[PDB]
Each structure stands twice: as structure tokens, then as C-alpha cells.
Amino acid sequence: MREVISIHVGQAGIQIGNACWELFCLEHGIQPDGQMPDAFNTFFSETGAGKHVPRCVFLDLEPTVVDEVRTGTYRHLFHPEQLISGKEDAANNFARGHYTIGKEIVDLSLDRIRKLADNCTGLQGFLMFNAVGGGTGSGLGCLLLERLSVDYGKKSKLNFCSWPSPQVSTAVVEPYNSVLSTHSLLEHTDVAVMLDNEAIYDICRRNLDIERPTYTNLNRLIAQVISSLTASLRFDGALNVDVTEFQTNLVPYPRIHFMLSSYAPIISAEKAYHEQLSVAEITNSAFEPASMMAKCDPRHGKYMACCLMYRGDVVPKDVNAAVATIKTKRTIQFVDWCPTGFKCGINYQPPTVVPGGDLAKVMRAVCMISNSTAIAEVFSRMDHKFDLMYAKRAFVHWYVGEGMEEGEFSEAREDLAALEKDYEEVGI
Amino acid sequence: MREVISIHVGQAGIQIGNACWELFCLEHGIQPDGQMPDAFNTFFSETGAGKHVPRCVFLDLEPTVVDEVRTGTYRHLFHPEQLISGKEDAANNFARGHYTIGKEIVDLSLDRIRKLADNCTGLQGFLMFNAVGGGTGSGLGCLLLERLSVDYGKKSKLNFCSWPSPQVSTAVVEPYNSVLSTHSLLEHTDVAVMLDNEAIYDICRRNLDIERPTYTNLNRLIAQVISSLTASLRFDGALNVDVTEFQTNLVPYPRIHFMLSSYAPIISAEKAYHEQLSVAEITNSAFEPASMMAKCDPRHGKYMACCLMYRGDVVPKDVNAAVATIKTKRTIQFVDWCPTGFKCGINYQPPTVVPGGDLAKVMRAVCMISNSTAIAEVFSRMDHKFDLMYAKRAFVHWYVGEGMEEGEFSEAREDLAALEKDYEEVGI
Amino acid sequence: MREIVHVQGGQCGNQIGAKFWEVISDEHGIDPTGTYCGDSDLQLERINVFYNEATGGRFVPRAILMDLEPGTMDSVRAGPFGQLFRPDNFVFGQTGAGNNWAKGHYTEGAELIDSVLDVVRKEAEGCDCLQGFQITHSLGGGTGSGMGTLLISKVREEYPDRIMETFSVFPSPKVSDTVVEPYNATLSVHQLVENADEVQVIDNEALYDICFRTLKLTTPTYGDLNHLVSAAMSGVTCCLRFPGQLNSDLRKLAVNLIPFPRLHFFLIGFAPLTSRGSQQYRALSVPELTQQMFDAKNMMCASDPRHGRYLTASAMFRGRMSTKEVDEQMLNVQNKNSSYFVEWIPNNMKSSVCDIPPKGLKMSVTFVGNSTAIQEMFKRVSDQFTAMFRRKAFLHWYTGEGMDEMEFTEAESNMNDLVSEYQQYQ
Amino acid sequence: MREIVHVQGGQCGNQIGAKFWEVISDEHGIDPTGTYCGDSDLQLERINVFYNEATGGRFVPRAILMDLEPGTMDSVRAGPFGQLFRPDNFVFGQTGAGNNWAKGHYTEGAELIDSVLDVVRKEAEGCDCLQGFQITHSLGGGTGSGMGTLLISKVREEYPDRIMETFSVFPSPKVSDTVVEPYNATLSVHQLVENADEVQVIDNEALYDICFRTLKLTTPTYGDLNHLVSAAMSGVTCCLRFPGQLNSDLRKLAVNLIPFPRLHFFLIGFAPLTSRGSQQYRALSVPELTQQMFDAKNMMCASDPRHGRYLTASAMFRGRMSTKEVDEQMLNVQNKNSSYFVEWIPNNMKSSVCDIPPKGLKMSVTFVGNSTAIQEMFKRVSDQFTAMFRRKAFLHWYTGEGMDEMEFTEAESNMNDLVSEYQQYQ
Amino acid sequence: NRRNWSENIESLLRQATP
């Protein structure tokens, strides 16, 4: 049976996966006890009489976020041996999470991953979520990436990473934690989607009209993004394009596998009260440059790949009519080597509403995976921040006095320099 | 019809006879009186009007535990003349347990050996349990096996040995008693099973999740091992496994008769609530080196052969699929002179759950008995330990004056070095 | 008698041909459980040309449902007439070709083709001698084009004296879904320009505009698209199931319409397409049938036949009609707009009469004809292919699956010989 | 008239042999209580081939069942149709064979053969003229391959001219149970090549293959595999209990399958065999009965017959079915893949018809085939057995009980000379 | 007993439909 195994590291990846699996259990009809009152097998292992367990693992080096999952509402849903946590938190330190303390937990992780993946052949890939701005998210998150390379060779590696958004970052050493993680995950992730927090804050401000929103409000939107991305495996549709279909249509080169996400309509029910949702309307709101989920305006960039996830009562004609108008408008621009630029998939199941959550019940929705060369400038600002902070030898002995030396720092800068130069060379 | 006669020498033997026969009564359905509310004939007798008494013997030199058995609950289950008790112990001395304080009870023990084995013809053999690190466990267990060898020659003597752990000994004169037990154990044992206490310490800590249990919780798992291994004698199965089956398929040369076991699933009520216990999932968990119950890592040891045997509602198609995938995996490897190295048995009756015990109601289980060449390290670590002890006359003033001479120590050193050379040439 | 063996390439081919067996089962009048109903011998005398007797009184299709992902076979077995196809006739993969010409054809599609060759020889050698094959697959997709064209290859070395006939859905310029079009497109065209006998092009955006401008149906699905393929694709094989005044099989139109083996890429149309609001308003005469027929808005391709000239064309008439209003109006179109036809063939048209019309209609026609105007289609694939090899992108799956660049350059050069060969005749 | 006495050794041969009596009792209308039901002359005019009248109207089996363990003897007796056998014909063993050929053949196998040789000869002489003995056992463990073949040796020196059938479950090649595999396999066969008239080679994982895909059983138990074998058993002896247009007994097989007395090893497979859904779709007919049989997938042996060449074979059809297409289909297959048949034999495999189909069926066929393509089966046991003798594995259970290594090298020589004898006929 | 069961295959080799 075909399945997908989810990986989460860090407190951000745990809180993302909590709301992600909240929505997955809701739409498959199972309760917090794991029992519903055979298309669910892609996420849920049928174990016993009517009881299902998620195919996901939660990773941390500190139990301060995991132990309330073991003492929460979803207590007997997640089986405790996939919720494994360390003792000491890496504390914004790649050297601690990748060279000192990640060793005694990674071999417990691989024992669970091999046990959970070898139970059923036909597995598709690893849907791994992480945060690169924090020490255990970057440290253990990077270390699992080499080991899953050498252990599972051919298989696809989905990556959503919480890249540090530019101004709001709630750290001081996010340049070291980010550039060292992306130095290695370039050659260890097959497909990597940016998720910046400020972009989701601006969407929560003006689209859902919440002035003071919390992190789990962001977790609801990211949950709806991944639910529409993996709805093709779970629900029947007119154009079933799998998660093996996403990279095989959208990554031009092995190095270029970084892209962006967006969702539409992010509408609450007092505005779905009024606004009729045409398929053309939700796909121009998804392509509005303000509604990007990585704070990356594509007006000063050029697209080279694009993938549309329509689900609900979407006629295949309105996919065709709407993609014609977005091709003709000059406010978006495509690169010259990629005249064809669209992969479209349709799912029949209508999207998710959560009562208590701020999203509304809508008849059709759009999810976006979009490769653009405008990622060159979101790494150019990371060049500016890291060069200022590395120029004066700052914060260096929390990385060199633990198990890695000077030289990974220079090779991470040269890796981002070659990655930078490779991007506009593609654009020309 | 058929019968097997248990021997329980040592304090470890007495309380493993309390545990193993508690599970035997709680599987066949006999009250502590001895009554019921033909498959039970393998272990119990047919005494009087519907009373059934165990076909075991309890040998110990100290009455402080064996009288404590005949004072408690099962005092009307066993025969009153059954539990043979000495007046004073050996106190971790092979010299007294084999020569001086031992000789006056072996004639009384073999008195009840022939009086209980002359009941019906069809006796598969004897099933002796001992503590190697203990004094009367290895002491009486030495000369009890020569006397069974010279009385009943061809009878299959299967012997469970609770071998002492490397850094867990709870004794200081462990290397002296273990070597002299080894000198007695090679030339008189058909089948041997290795039980290092620190490995059952760990497979209850990580697999049962119980973190501070006692010795009796170890005895739950060992009782589940025998209640697996011998229930194919009792109940119907797809492939019945006899006592005489084991020594005809697990010993390649008569000196390599040291086999090491594992069990799956050692799973409590709260991990059986969440994992499906498929035949593929339960087999590779039995071969996982952490689940091994003698702390002898087989990654660097070459497997000679192996005998999986299953219980429950196991379909033989899934047996052959699971036995094939553990053939094709590369981390395990075989000796090239034994390409076919697996034997399978199937029993239908599922393992009964003991109340109070930490195990759950399991729908299908696995017991495994393997022979390999990894047994080189389990003795080589003891060789440097004992040579370092014997260098400057440690504790030998007891052993010289209590019956034996110096020279038995050197001859017991020469034949353990002989099995060092014997194990390496099998693994060439 | 003869039997045509059907094969079902890709998830698109499974959907477009399952509704081909909507109209074959309807016209021959069979129950979803396979029991004949209708009480007339015009159906079941010639019933073995698509079906097989099942010794249960029912008829099982001689079709090979085929895909590398098991999702779409669940869809085609759960719909109407899903109790028709034998489960042994389904072949499935467990991985799924991710619209890839590379792994669909050589590495991940090759391990299925040995069992698909077992099941197509299962139903071909079972009879006395079959007539040919029909192959509905996809060129936009990678599993219809990848291992389906491997099926097209190995059946030509197996039965070279036979004939094959393919209906392949092409990529489309305006709505370019399945963004990896031209790898799967022009390399399958490279394969089958020698290794196929007779090709019809189907264009999904063409089926959009016909349902717009001749049916006025507001919200069609892919089912309405598949119906418009299916009615024409049964009309091209009317004679093998029903008698007529003038009889012609698909080998008749094979020899008649290709003067050269290197050119066998054609176009289908269908008539009459009448709206439900125009059904009472529309006269049904052979004049109105053929004066609607030779119209670009009726064509099943997004290539304009007025730009080019027809090379050799034919028409399968169905129903009860006068013989000579077939004849003098195939000549009438030749004599009025005579600039649109080639000069060195006298009487470039051909026609045939199948006396049984499709149900609910008293006559119809299906046109299969050659055009030089198919050249702009292949050149549209060509200039997209050379603009994207000018940056060498999108290649790392193709060169990493075990295949080389030298067959990519051969693929461009061979179809550039095809666009030049079509260039000569206008 | 004609009588067949059944010999079943080992618990494998007793389980797959009890099902043989369950399908024969089903075919001849006998109840488990021994009362006929089904009021037909033609189910009952030939009972004596397998049953004797027991002065109570009970038709009791002519089967001797032997084992060295009683745990499987009482499971046969307590099972359904298990009270049919006479209790004296059960041969109990108390000690038991621990999967050792030496003890099953010499020490206590001979201690039991004095009590099983008398019971097979009480049954044998009681009839006027016995036709043959059949044996059903396995070479995996000890009591079937050590004592069942020792009874084979004793009945050969007693009744030489009688035919000597055996149906041996060889150990499965790539999925190895019974960890001392090649000793119980090779040490039986070199003693079996001089004491057997017909040997029929069946493998366990070949039965696992045909349950996995062609029959589509989600949980194939041992009782499923026993009935695949059992349905193949009734086709070999159909003409012995039923009349036919062209009859064929067991010795009709022996004369047309072996040209030399040294080779008598065959390949058994049964048709028709489809899944639950596919049975409702499939056409049961004489063409669609025979290319299922000439197929490596149908074969109940895990040796691919396509790798070598068919020397001779046979097919026994069953049911109300015509005799022309018996042979026209028999020789159309002999003309299409003509490289698969040896060139120096006429019409290499023979034909037979038995008028009575198996119960429920109307058409079936069995097949007994002597092919040189069983060489990869013998060689895979060969190189595993020599791998045992590079470093002298498990010898002490074979040396101290009454034989030596001279018989080990005798087993290697008397098996390798069949390897070279088979190698020189292609 | 439970060693041997022909209950699925028994219906698989009869041409009967439920």
C-alpha cells in the first residue's frame, strides 16, 4: 500500500505537526482516541480493530514541548515511541545539534523510522518539516538529512523549512543557524519550500482580519497548505498528480530545488458571506504578489516553474480558462526557456473547515508550489546579515568549542556564493 | 504419552521454577490446588482424582527460599517430597557445591529423578535451569549433569543458563565459578541457552517501558520464552517443533552447542494499543540487536543458523514472506558453509497474558533460538577478567582447601581456550 | 472471424477508452453484467470483432487496461460498465510514472511490459487470427507514452504483417498542463514515425472549442470530451460490426490514405454535432452533413486545414442514404474550394457506407483524412523543444535514468525530416 | 479388476494425501460416514480402484498412513473425512524423526518398517490383480524422506513389475524451511532413482506463487496448497475409475514419458485455475485450456521450463469435450514455439480424454511432463549440498547411527551423473 | 484439523456465483 512518512524536528516543527495532524485526523473522521465511528492508509496505519496511528515522528532535544503532547487532548492518538525527545536543548547552536548532542538521539530516531517504514512496501517519500532558525531544528534536522540520504537512497525528500523571515526573527544568531543548515541541505533535500513567519502574519492581518494572532493561527494555515498538497494521494480526483509529481515537473536542475508556497482564498466566513469564489478569482488572489508565504515579491523575479492544486467542486474547464488569463497578463513574467509553465491537479473532496479555527468553509481552494529566481534576493539579504556578523569574529566560540572547527563557516559562505551565482546564470 | 522433566538448581532455578510453572498453570487452566474447573500431560501428572502435579524438581542447598516456596500459595500444588532442600549453601563456591556440601543431596535428587521419570515412556528429555555465577547453581548443577549422563545417556538434556553479565555480576568470585561451570558444561550438554541478566534488564526498560522492576519481572520474560518453546509439544500447529527437533538442527559440531535467544513483542498494554503485530514487523524486531537477551552483539558475529518459531493466528504465507525479507537484508550475514540457515515452526494457541505481569494480551508472538560465532566475545571478555583474577592468587585459598587441587583451574583454562580456537575456525 | 485487440495506455487512455466501451456496449446492446438485450441479429452476428465469448453467455472485452499507478483502474472499475472488463485484463504498476519519458520507457516501465506482452498474446493467439490493434494512449503523459510506446514497439516485431491504429492525445499550446510536454511528445513521435502504421491526433483544447461552438454545453467534464472521441472512434470501425452497401475496414483506409510510409499522421472529425436546443431545428441531410463536416470548428485538432492542403482523405458514412449524394458531394467539395486539395491525386476523397447508424441518429459520418496542415502542430512542438534545449534545462531526470543525449538529437533531426517532408507537398 | 494402494509418509504427505481421499470421496459420492449419495451408476461402477467393501456398505480407503509421530496422526483422524480410514491402517511412531535421513532410514525407521510392510501386503494381495502403488511424501524432513522411501525400496524388491508412482514435495529453493535441507533432499533421490517408476516433482513455493497471482488468495493456508496438488492427483487417475473415448492408465504414462529407465522425473500442473472474479469472466474451452498449461507460471514446480527443452509430456483432458481440437491445439502449440520441443521425438506429448469432468467443472486437464529443464532445480540443491561438504556440516547425527562418508560421495556421484545425463540431451 | 482447510479454494474450483 502507498503511504507517506512524516518527519518533524524542533519546537516549530512539532507545533506545525500538531495542527497538521489535527486537520488530518479531522478530515479522515477519526477521533482523538484514534478510532473512527480504505483511502486513509497513506497517512494512518491500520493497527487493531478500527484504530489508526499516524505515520509521523516528533523530534526535539528538549521535552518542554513534547511532554504536553503526551499529557494533552491527543494523548492516545500519537503513540509515544514516535514522540521522542532529548534532555538538553541545543540552544541556537548548530555545533551542539550536529556534533555534540544529536548523536545519542539520532540512532533512536532511525530505529523508529526503519521500523515504521519497513512495515509496508510502496512508500512514496518523507514529508519532513523543520525550522532552520533554531539550534535543535537546524542541528538534528540537518543530521537526519545525511543519514536518510545514505540509508534511503532513491526516495523523495519533501522539505518545508521555517526560514528566518527578515525583520521579525526572535533570535540573534539566526545567520549562523540558517547558512550552516542550507549549506548542507542543498545536497540532501530533493524539494524545499520556504515558509517565513512575517508572510503568514501579514496574511493573518488583512485576509482573515485578526489584529493580534498567535503561532497556532499560523499553524492552521500551514496545515491547510500541506493538506491540499497531499490531498491527491488521499482523495480521488480528475487529475491525480502525486507528491512524486511535484519535483518531477518543477525542479529544473539538481541544485535549483528551492521554491515558495501560497494559498487562496484565506477567507473567513464573514467575507465568504459576500464574496463569490470563482476559480479564476482564487487563482489571481493566489498569484497576487502580496499573498506570498515567504515574503518574496516576484515582480523583480522571473518564474521558471509553477504547480496548481485545485480541490473541491472544480470543473477542469475553469482551470484552463484561468491559466489562460494569468499567462496573458504581463504583471507576471516567465523565463524564456520555459514557455510551458504549469502543472495542474484536481481533487474532488472539498477543503477543510475547523470550528474554533478562523478558516471558513469554502467550495474550492488553491495551493501553490512556485519556483522563482527571486529567491536570489532573499539569500542576498542573508549574505548581508551574515557578512556583518562574521566580519568581527562574533559568537564564534559557541560553535568551535563543541566539536566542529573553523572551515565549515568559510565553506558555507562559498557554498552560498556558488548557489547565488548559479541562480542568475539560470535567469539569463 | 510424552513428558519433559524440569530441573531447577540454584536460587535462580527455584524462582524461575516459581515463574515458569506459574505460567504453565495459568495457560492450561489449573488452580493452585491442582485441579481443573490431554495436552496438559506434557508437564503435569495424573495423580488421584483429577489432581495434576508438576513434573519438575527443585534443587537448592539453602532452605531460606525453597521452604519459603512450600509455605506460600503453591504448597499444595507440588509434591511435599518434591522440593529437596539442603542445610547450608555453597556461598559462591564451586568447590563445595561440587565436592563437599554437594554430595549428600545429589543422591536424594536422583532418587526423585528416576521415581518421576519412570511414569510413562515417551520422555523427550530434561530441562535444567541454573545460575552460572552462583555457587550452588553451578556447583550442584555440575555433578547433577554427570550423573544424568551416566544414567540416561541419549536423553536430550536442554539447559537454560542464566549467564552473568560483563559489568553486572553482584559477585566478585564470578570468574572462578563461571570457568569451572564451563569446564563441566561443554562435554555434558546437548542444548544451551544464554541468559545475561543485564540484557533482560534493558529489554524491559526500553521495550516494556517499565524503568525500575525487580528480579521477578525478569522471570516473566524467561517464562514466556519456555512457554513458547515447549507449547509446540502440547497443542496443534502448522509445523510442530519437538524437544528432539532442537538438538537435531541447532548444533553443527558437538562443541558449538551454545545458542542465544530473543523474543518479540516485549510490549506492554499501551504499545499493543497502537502497533499492528504483523509477521514482518515481529520478525525483524526479534533480530534487532537491542532486543537480544544476552548482550552479545551479532553485527560482528556470523550467524551459523537459527530457528524461528511462532505462536498465535499466524498464516504461513506471512511466515515465508517475513523469512525471505530477513534473508535479503544485508546487515545480517551468514556463514558461507550454511546457506540455508532458517527453520520455522508454527503453533496456533496464542500466549496467555498473566495478570499483574507487565506484558499485554498478545495476539501473536515469536521465540527465536540462534547459533552464531558472536559467542567469541561473550567468553573472551571473561577470559581477560579471569586471567587478571588468577594472576596473583585471588580467593584461591578457599578453593584449594575445600576438596580440589590447583591444576583443575589450568585445565579449565585450556579447554575454554580450545573453544576460542574452535569458534574462530568455524567463522573463517 | 477477425478481432481488434484494444490496449489502454496511461490513465488518460483508461478514461477515454472505457467510454469507448460505453458506446460499443450501447450499440451492441449489452447489460453491465454482460447479458445481451435488444433482440436483433445486426449486433451479435459481428460481436467477436471487439468481444470474446465467455461461456457464461456474456461477452468480455478484448481490451488491455494498462497503467503504472493503480489509482485510475479503481475509477474505471467503479463507474458504469465496470463489471464488463476482466480483472486479468488489468495490468498495474505499484510505483507510478511521474509523467516521465525516461523512467516510463526504459527503467520503471520495462518491468511491466513483459507481463503486458503476456496478456496481449493471451487474447491474440486465443483466436484463429486477429485483424489488428487499436491503441488509445497519451503523449502528454509519461506512462501512456513511456511503456505504451514500448508496447507499440514490441508488437511490431511480434506481428509485423498485422496493422495497428493509434489514437494519441497530443499536448496543447494554450493550456499547457503537464508542463513536461515535449520530452514525452516528440520522442514518442520519433518512435512511432517509423514504428506505427496509422496515427490520429486528438487535442483536448480542440474538444473544448467544439463543445463550445457546436454544442453550446455550459459545463462539460472530461467525460463529454471522451464521448466526442468515442463516437468518431466507433464510426471509423462501423463496417467490421455492421454490414453495408459499400464495405471498408481500417486496412482499406490504411492503404488508401498514405501514399508513403513516412507520412501517416492524420486528423479525425465527427458529425452531426447538434445542440439540444438546436436538435429540433436541424435538418439531417447528407448536404448539411458534409457542409458542416469540412469546417475547422468541427475538427478534432487545433490545426487549421485551410492553412495547408489535404493529401488523401476519406469518410465513413453511417446510416441509410442515397449513394450518389455521397458521391456527387464528395465531388462537389472537390470542385468548389479546389485550392484546398492536392493537384496530383484525381478524386482525393473516398467514402464507405455502413448501413447501421449510431443509436438515436438516423445517419452520421466520421472523417479520417491526411493534411499538410498537421505540419504546424509538429513545428509548434519543435520550436518549444529547441528553445528549451537552448538552455539545456529539465534534463537531469532524462540523462540520469540511464539514457543519453545522442537520441535526443536524433529525435529532433528525425521529426525535422518529417516537417521537411510535409513541407514539400504544399 | 484394477486397484491402487495408497502409501502416505510424513505429515506433509499425510496432509496432502488426506485431501486426495477427500476429493475422491467427493467424486464418488461417498459420505464421511461411508454411505453413497448421488444415485448415479457411473459414480459407482468403479469403486475398487480405491475402496474395499467392508461388510457394512462402507467403502473404506485402501490407504496405509505412516508416521513416526502421533501428533499429526490424530489430527488427521479428528479432522473432517478423517474417520473414513480404518484405524489399523494408521501406523504410529513413538520416538520420532528429528528431520534426519539417517534415523528415518536405518535405526527406528527400520524398527517401524516391519509393522508397515505387513499392512501394505495385507491390502495388496486381497485383490485379484493390483495395478500399482502410489506414494505421497516430501523430502524436507526425516520421516517422509527416510522411511517413506525405505518402504519404496521394500515394495520394489517384493513386487518389481508393478508401477511405482511417487509425489515428492522437494524443499523450496529460495525460501528454505527445514534447515537441514540438502541432506534430506539428495540422500533420498539417489536411492529413489533405482526404485521408482514415476516421480512427479512439486515444490512448495511454486504453489505459493500460483496462489499469489493466478488464483488471487489473500491468505493461502496449507490446506489451500494441498488441494492444488489434490486436484492434479485426480486427473492422473481419471481413466482408472471412469470410462473415456480414449483411455490412459498410469503405465500408459510410463511408456510415453520415459525413454530410458534412469530418468523418471516429471512436472505436474493443473488447469483451469482462476480467481473468484476471473472465473465469472473466463471462457472454459479447449483453446483456453491449453496455453494456460504450456506456461511456466501454471507449473507446480519452482523450476522454469522455458529455460530448457521439453523431452516428452502428456495431457489428460476431462469432461464432455471434443477430440479434434484435443490434437489441433496440441500441435498448433507444437508448431508455434517449435524451439521449445526436442527435435528427435514424434508429437512429443501425448493426448488422453476422460469423459467425466471434475466435480463442478465441465472441462479440465492435467499434465505429466518429463523435461530437461528441471536441471536448475537439481543444481541449486547441488551447490548448497556441496557447500555443506566443504566444511562437513551436521555430520554427527549421520555418522554415529550407521553410515559413513562413502555413502555421502555415493550420493554426490549418483546425483551428478543424472546432472550430466540431463545435460547431454539438449 | 487446522493444519488443513479447503474452504476458499473449494469454492474457487466450482463455477458458482453468490
Ligand SMILES: Nc1nc2c(ncn2[C@@H]2O[C@H](COP(=O)(O)OP(=O)(O)OP(=O)(O)O)[C@@H](O)[C@H]2O)c(=O)[nH]1
Ligand atoms: N510559523 C511558526 N513558527 C514557529 C513556531 N514555533 C516556533 N517558530 C519559529 O521558530 C524559530 C526558532 O525555532 P524554534 O522552534 O523556536 O527552536 P528550534 O528550531 O526547535 O531550536 P532551538 O531554538 O534550539 O530550540 C522562531 O524564530 C519562531 O519564529 C510555530 O508554531 N509556527
Ligand SMILES: Nc1nc2c(ncn2[C@@H]2O[C@H](COP(=O)(O)OP(=O)(O)OP(=O)(O)O)[C@@H](O)[C@H]2O)c(=O)[nH]1
Ligand atoms: N535471570 C535470572 N538470574 C538470576 C535470578 N536469580 C539469581 N540470578 C543470577 O544468579 C547470580 C547469583 O546466583 P543465585 O541464583 O542468586 O544464587 P545460587 O544459585 O543459589 O548460588 P549461591 O550464590 O551460592 O547462593 C546473580 O548474579 C544473578 O545474576 C533470577 O531469578 N533470574
Ligand SMILES: Nc1nc2c(ncn2[C@@H]2O[C@H](COP(=O)(O)OP(=O)(O)O)[C@@H](O)[C@H]2O)c(=O)[nH]1
Ligand atoms: N480527453 C481526455 N484527456 C485527458 C483525460 N485525462 C487526462 N487527459 C489529458 O492528458 C494530459 C494529462 O496526462 P496524464 O494522462 O494525466 O499523465 P499520465 O498518467 O502519465 O498518462 C492532460 O493534457 C489532459 O488534458 C481524459 O479522461 N480525457
Ligand SMILES: Nc1nc2c(ncn2[C@@H]2O[C@H](COP(=O)(O)OP(=O)(O)O)[C@@H](O)[C@H]2O)c(=O)[nH]1
Ligand atoms: N504442501 C505441503 N507441504 C507441507 C505440509 N506440511 C509440511 N510441509 C512441508 O514439508 C517441509 C518439511 O518437511 P516435513 O513435512 O516437516 O517433514 P517430513 O514429513 O519428515 O518430510 C516444509 O518445507 C513444509 O513446507 C503440507 O500440508 N503441505
Ligand SMILES: [Mg+2]
Ligand atoms: Mg535546540
Ligand SMILES: [Mg+2]
Ligand atoms: Mg547458593
